[PDB]
Every structure is written in structure tokens, then in C-alpha cells.
Ligand binder design. Structure first.
Ligand SMILES: COc1ncccc1CC(=O)N1CCC[C@@H](C(N)=O)C1
Ligand SMILES: [Zn+2]
Length: 139
């Protein structure tokens, strides 16, 4: 689990979005595993606006943060789950590291701010859904 709170928005993994998230829907993209809902309180997370390929992510299954090198956002093939059939997930970044399903939502950060959230894993690779291109989260 995990979310990003920025301005009057809440960014979550689309597959973990709640009834409240869907009742206050702003934008969702199944191909990215992202959903943004509106909030009443003001969030103060800072979104990174950069091309960093190194950062640190929170891994709840180890209660630890790990430093990683990660690929630029791209279309990557992802195996089926109870939420999606096998498909290409877009805007995804991979790194070598540990993850388990419950780790989705963990934040990846660089020196500039939030980069994305854990969204996929398997075979010793962890994938992060990028949010740096969503310039509207700040306005
Ligand atoms: C962090 O996730 C994992 N890590 C290790 C093993 C397995 C996982 C689960 C995984 O990959 N998922 C979770 C359900 C949604 C799927 C998607 N985005 O298409 C991805
Ligand atoms: Zn950065």
C-alpha cells in the first residue's frame, strides 16, 4: 500500500484504489496502473521534474529503503494478475531489487522529490510507475 499527496490530489496504484478514490476520480490510466483522486486537505509532497535514473525506494516487505539505478519510463511486458491480463504497462521503470505484491505503493524518490510508486515485481526486478510527466499534479 501507499499513496502520494500533492495539492488537492491523491495518487495511488489503480489496482489498489478504494471506493472513495473511484467516487472522487480525477484521472485513471489502466495501461499505467495509476489512479488520481481529489482530496479536501492540502497535500505537500513534492513531485520531481527531472531525468534522474538513481534514487531510493521504500520496501515495506523489508521495512527498509534501498538505493537503486532504474531504467527511463517505457512500455514493458507484465504477466497476468487478478487485476489485469498479460499486457504492456506504459511509463514503467525497472530496477534490480526486492518486491512482493504488498510493496505496491512504496515511493521512489530522488534529490528533486517523488519520482513514482512501486507497481510491479518479480524475478528480482522491481517496477515503478513514473509520475514526473504529470505536470498538472502541481497546478
Ligand atoms: C511489487 O509487485 C510484485 N512484486 C513481486 C511479485 C509480484 C508482484 C505483484 C505485481 O507485479 N503486480 C501486482 C498487481 C498489479 C500488477 C500490474 N501492475 O500489472 C503488478
Ligand atoms: Zn531527480
Amino acid at each position: 500500500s501507499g499513496a502520494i499527496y500533492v495539492g488537492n490530489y491523491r495518487v495511488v496504484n489503480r489496482h489498489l484504489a478504494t471506493h472513495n478514490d473511484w467516487a472522487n476520480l480525477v484521472w485513471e490510466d489502466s495501461s499505467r496502473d495509476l489512479l488520481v483522486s481529489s482530496t479536501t486537505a492540502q497535500g505537500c509532497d513534492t513531485i520531481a521534474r527531472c531525468d534522474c535514473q538513481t534514487g531510493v525506494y521504500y520496501c515495506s516487505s523489508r521495512r527498509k529503503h534501498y538505493p537503486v539505478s532504474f531504467s527511463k519510463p517505457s512500455l514493458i511486458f507484465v504477466e497476468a494478475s487478478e487485476y489485469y491480463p498479460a499486457r504492456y504497462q506504459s511509463h514503467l521503470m525497472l530496477a534490480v531489487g526486492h518486491s512482493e505484491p504488498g510493496d505496491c505503493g512504496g515511493i521512489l524518490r530522488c534529490q528533486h522529490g517523488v519520482v513514482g510508486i512501486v507497481s510491479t515485481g518479480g524475478n528480482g526486478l522491481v517496477g515503478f510507475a513514473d509520475v514526473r510527466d504529470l505536470l498538472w499534479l502541481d497546478e
